[PDB]
Amino acid sequence: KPFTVPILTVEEMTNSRFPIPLEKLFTGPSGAFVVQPQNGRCTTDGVLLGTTQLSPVNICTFRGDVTHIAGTHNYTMNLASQNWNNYDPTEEIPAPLGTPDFVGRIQGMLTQTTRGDGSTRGHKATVSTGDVHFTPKLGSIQFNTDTNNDFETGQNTKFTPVGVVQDGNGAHQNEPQQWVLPSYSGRTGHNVHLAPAVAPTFPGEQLLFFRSTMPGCSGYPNMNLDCLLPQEWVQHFYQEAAPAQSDVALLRFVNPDTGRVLFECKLHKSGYVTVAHTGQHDLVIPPNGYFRFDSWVNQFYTLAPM
Amino acid sequence: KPFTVPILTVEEMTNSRFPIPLEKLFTGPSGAFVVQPQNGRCTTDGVLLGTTQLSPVNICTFRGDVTHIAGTHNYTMNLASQNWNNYDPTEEIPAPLGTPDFVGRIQGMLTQTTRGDGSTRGHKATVSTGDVHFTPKLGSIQFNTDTNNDFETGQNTKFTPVGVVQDGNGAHQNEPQQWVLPSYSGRTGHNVHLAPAVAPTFPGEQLLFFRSTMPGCSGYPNMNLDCLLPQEWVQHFYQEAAPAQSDVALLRFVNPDTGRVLFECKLHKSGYVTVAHTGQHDLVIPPNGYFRFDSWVNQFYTLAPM
């Protein structure tokens, strides 16, 4: 059974750490930080890792009931699974699948439906993933909303993420921090069952990042969001689950007009990409271009300079 | 090469007419109205129809610059491509790909980044797809918002859909109208290049609907949203593009525990599903079950009663 990556241009694909389209390809040194994202983690032979799931529209969503915190505009959400069933914290995963894997304040809307009469309500809401009340592994988080009396108890409530905000009083672009993992269990304990951090081991190589720009909803947020794998690649690897003939798959980025190769790269079995380049660089690509698996290569294969 | 459908449970798949997951399966008589959605339309041999595109996060989103309308809290948006390039009306499609294909008020958030200093802003917004200002084919739509003086001109603005609303002063669930196509060019002319309407032509058959519940943001909306194909099926068919051996593909819905078949259905080459049943029915399915392609059959194959 032959390994493949889907024939999809960068802009046709979807970011795996936030429900938004990919925009561009970026590479740079990653020594000054720990690249350990938990969403968008999948092996080429079809093993989902960390908190990665299949649905691109369920990333950074939250479902459950809410209870008002007296004298505030905040609500505690007791988390439920996507199918509105009881969340199970004993499962061997870092957090509920699709849980945000970066520290920062995410804004969207809390919506709610009253089961008895079909009445509905919706409000802007913010969740702080670096907050002490952000404890999804324990099954509980907190929102700041625009209301203080509207949301009802014991009723299905959903949070739909839109973008990220930033306290404009602090240094510009100081949040969100996309390479800092939240403490899924808050102050209670350390993170568990994490997908491993990644780094280029072969000299002269850097990680290839699939970049999007998260929408900003307030302040001066850092809107860069990089993932190791497009969500479609995750979905594809899970379905196909083809055997890896090696630890490294040689991909060629190709222009379908002529077949000419813009550059080549290494897709690692454990699920990330490296290129042969040194320095920060926004890759300039033909809009119709796409990745093409050509062969399995030795782990210590020397790429052509990007 | 062989035709297939993805191995995904219903709840693991995404509604193709709105960026939310699927929840259940439904069948009902559809004579009293015209079923002609333009999103979630694809042939089994891989031809996209209507306004259908590949990414599920792009359904019912809008990108462009906005202009305030004197004396109101409304804004006109001059539409752009997903990649912020100029939108082209002359392309032979009904509207920009991903455009809402029902009539009703969709509520979400308008966010905006100021190119110069990186400042951002966000407000609740509703687009009324049934009114005259909804002219996406012409490259212009209009939003009702919370703000009055906060959005800037000449700046990248995005609309992120969340749910739908309804006026409680009227009969409950009287909007939205999911089977009523909006006029993509307003009153300037009729819709063009539409995907054809679908109706069971075989005696004893009804359409099978992939049903989701849209979030409600105000009032008592009708939150049923039905598509003819999951978004993953669309993505799959587009990639695979296997030749159709006949106009009808037989599918079995199986429980992977035992391989036991719950029901069979017809996946028509033009991209929709029928079952053998009369009357409205919510299909009771095991949550691990999925569709499996078994064989190409004669057009006039008689399904077993579901």
């Epitope: 032979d45 079809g46 093993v47 055997p243 890896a244 003939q245 | 191995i7 992977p256 999925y290």
Partner: antibody
């Protein structure tokens, strides 16, 4: 405490049928590929049958194709092996085993958790 | 049917000795090779998976190497509890196959 407990087995005349069970604890069985491995008296290990993860699908050694049926029950978190038209070459200790990693169908990892084994004897 | 052939079929060694068991495949199985230890009357125990990864709970003295067709289980310092039968197993493709096994006994 991840664990596989086996039941069933015993002896049966040649041509007869037997059923093996394997109840899982501490993990959801339907999420991992499950395998039946057998060992004849004084012999090595032989692969009998596997079922995939959440997507299922089944696989068989030619020896037992058409005679054996592997299946599971998610509501009981149990794996089953149905054997019929049994012959002397089926006399062995039968083990159920779980794949390390979760997959859609049949994966490529080793088997990290094992049942204690059930004895099957086919004799007149 | 991918055939796996272990070498040797049996060995004996003193405590502290370096023990090497090789497995050769009839065709390339990439790195999808696993090693098991079986005590008599007991279920096998996963030692090495993916040719070179140490299963948790397994002592550091066990180690694996190789890819394609040729693989090696190595015990850096043989211990009395390491007695038993060792099986290599490929999971590259169905039918899943085992080596004929290797008997490891201790001298004293």
């Amino acid at each position: 405490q991840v664990q596989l407990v086996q039941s069933g087995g015993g002896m049966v005349q040649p041509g007869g049928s037997l059923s093996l069970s394997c109840a899982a604890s501490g993990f959801t069985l339907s999420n991992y590929a499950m395998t039946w491995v057998r060992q004849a008296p004084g012999k090595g290990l032989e692969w009998v049958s596997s079922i995939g993860g959440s997507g299922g699908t089944t696989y068989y050694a030619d020896s037992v194709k058409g005679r054996f049926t592997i299946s599971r029950d998610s509501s009981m978190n149990t794996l089953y092996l149905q054997m019929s038209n049994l012959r002397a070459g089926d006399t062995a200790v039968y083990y159920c085993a779980k794949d390390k990693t979760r997959t859609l169908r049949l994966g490529y990892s080793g088997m990290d958790v094992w049942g204690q084994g059930t004895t099957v004897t086919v004799s007149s | 049917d991918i055939r796996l052939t272990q070498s040797p079929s049996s060995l004996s060694a003193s405590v502290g000795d370096r023990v090497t068991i090789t497995c050769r495949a009839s065709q390339s199985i990439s790195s999808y090779l696993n090693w098991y230890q079986q005590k008599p009357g007991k279920a096998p125990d996963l030692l090495i998976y993916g040719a070179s990864s140490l299963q948790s709970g397994v002592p550091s003295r066990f180690s694996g190497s190789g890819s394609g067709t040729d693989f090696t289980l190595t015990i850096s310092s043989l211990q009395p509890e390491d007695f038993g039968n060792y099986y290599c197993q490929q999971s590259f493709s169905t039918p899943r196959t085992f080596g004929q096994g290797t008997k490891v006994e201790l001298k004293r």
